[PDB]
A paper describes a structure:
EY-[name] (3,3′-ethyne-1,2-diylbis-{6-[(chloroacetyl)amino]benzenesulfonic acid}) is a chemical cross linker that can react simultaneously with two cysteines in the i and i+11 positions of the α-helix19. To test whether EY-[name] detects the formation of a helix, we chose two amino acid residues separated by 11 amino acids in the proposed fusion helix and mutated them to cysteines. In conclusion, we have developed a new method that can convert two pre-existing α-helices into one long extended helix.
To confirm the validity of our EY-[name] method, we designed several fusion proteins containing the protein A domain inserted into loops preceding internal rather than terminal α-helices of T4 [name]. Of the three possible insertion sites, we chose the loop containing residue 37 and designed three helix-fusion proteins, 8,155, 8,157 and 8,158 containing the EY-[name]-binding sites. To confirm fusion of the α-helices connecting protein A and [name], we crystallized 8,155 after reaction with EY-[name] and determined its crystal structure. The 8,155 crystals diffracted X-rays towards 2.7 angstrom resolution. In the crystal structure, one EY-[name] molecule is covalently connected to the two cysteines in the fusion helix as expected. The distance between the Cα atoms of the reacted cysteines is 16.7 angstrom, which is shorter by only 0.1 angstrom than that of 3,311 treated with EY-[name]. For example, one can insert a helical chaperone protein like cytochrome cb562 into a loop preceding or following an α-helix in the target protein and connect the α-helices of the target and the chaperone protein using EY-[name] as shown in the crystal structure of 8,155.
Numbering used by the authors: 1 to 35, 1219 to 1266, 38 to 164
Amino acid sequence: MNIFEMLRIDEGLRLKIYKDTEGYYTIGIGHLLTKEQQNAFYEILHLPNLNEEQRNAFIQSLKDDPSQSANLLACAKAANDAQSLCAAKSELDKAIGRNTNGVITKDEAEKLFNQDVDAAVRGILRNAKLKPVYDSLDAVRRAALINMVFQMGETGVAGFTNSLRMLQQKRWDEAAVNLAKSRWYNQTPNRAKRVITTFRTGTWDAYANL
């Protein structure tokens, strides 16, 4: 047990590229890659990832039959997305060092993950709200803080003013009681419970079994 097994259980590990419900392409453990007929003509012509010609064929197809505004605007969006995915794969391929076709192995996911951890800690140590509590914690409690950062971002975590302070004061059972009252806990109870147990105990016990 170690931090990568922790976030693999909590966050999940995808060996194939996935598109978020909010539109981001991701892979591994939360590794992010890339960020009537009148409106038909308009939006087709404003899709950010089409070619000149790819767009020509759609625009001129609409001219040929304006009735099919529904289908041509459907085609145009398929294409725009097909490209974004292409860009993400490309972004992935530079990261892995081969032509993955949007597929990686676990060790490659772990390699991505380990630098992602490096990014988060850098951020954390630059954040005046998170630094003093993070320096104060031991390695496994730090894993719990990083864990939270992965799920909601530096800023969200940094907004747990009080529980953070209790953590910094080594008041672990106070801290655990306070995290449970949170909106985080209410949105993802099973995960928050494991994280909070990690904060409270300084151990990996919440992940034993499972």
